[PDB]
């Protein structure tokens, strides 16, 4: 059995940046399930994983264009402190969730001011070059609830 559209992929991956610093790793003992044919993940990983048999080990290079996209200066904006809650005092590095009409997007604080703060909404990997070492542990059909989500 091979990867195909509307099939859940149990992924155990090791990803590294071009610099050579680890960001995350999914062990083979607990692969992270993901959908296919939707594009919600990194485009490079989604495209490379296409047509790969179960248990295959491969390495693929992922670029910024292939990633979610380039860095855009419009996603970093200063915004008052009144536009946060859930924190006794707005701290540096906290992450927030803009409930955009399109959908949920992240908003992370880069710096803190007296009555204001500096935040950035861009993804962590945006504008970065990455290398993915991946292994397809198992393959199964996506459920109706998973497809809806």
């Amino acid at each position: 059995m091979k990867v195909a559209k509307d099939l859940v992929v149990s992924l155990a991956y090791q990803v590294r940046t071009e610099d050579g610093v680890l960001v995350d790793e999914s062990p083979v003992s607990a692969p992270l399930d993901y959908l296919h044919g939707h594009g919600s993940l990194i485009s490079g990983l989604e495209t490379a994983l296409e047509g790969h048999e179960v248990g295959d080990k491969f390495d693929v290079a992922v670029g910024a264009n292939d990633a979610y996209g380039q860095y855009d200066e419009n996603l970093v904006q200063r915004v008052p402190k009144d536009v946060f809650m859930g924190v006794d005092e707005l701290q540096v590095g906290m992450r927030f969730l803009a409930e955009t009409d399109q959908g949920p997007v992240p908003v992370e604080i880069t710096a803190v001011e007296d009555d204001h703060v500096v935040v950035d909404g861009n993804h962590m990997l945006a504008g970065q070059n990455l290398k993915f070492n991946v292994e397809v542990v198992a393959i199964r059909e996506a459920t109706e609830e998973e497809l809806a989500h």
Partner: protein, 65 residues
């Protein structure tokens, strides 16, 4: 001459009375034209309507690749 028939006078008077409101605005003091208190009410409306309850909530974690 001068408009003769009752229809003529009725039409002229109707048109004058319909243009009448735009020419009696001349005698309205500016205070009654736009009261200051009601203008403050409209300013309050603009600010309040601009107000939106959407307010950033904390995030559990960022998205994964």
């Amino acid at each position: 001459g001068v408009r003769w028939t009752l229809w003529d006078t009725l039409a002229f008077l109707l048109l004058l009375s319909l243009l009448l409101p735009s020419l009696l605005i001349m005698f309205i003091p500016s205070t009654f034209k736009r009261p200051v208190s009601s203008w403050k009410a409209r300013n309050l409306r603009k600010t309040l309507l601009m107000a939106s309850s959407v307010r950033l909530k904390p995030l559990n974690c960022s998205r994964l690749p």
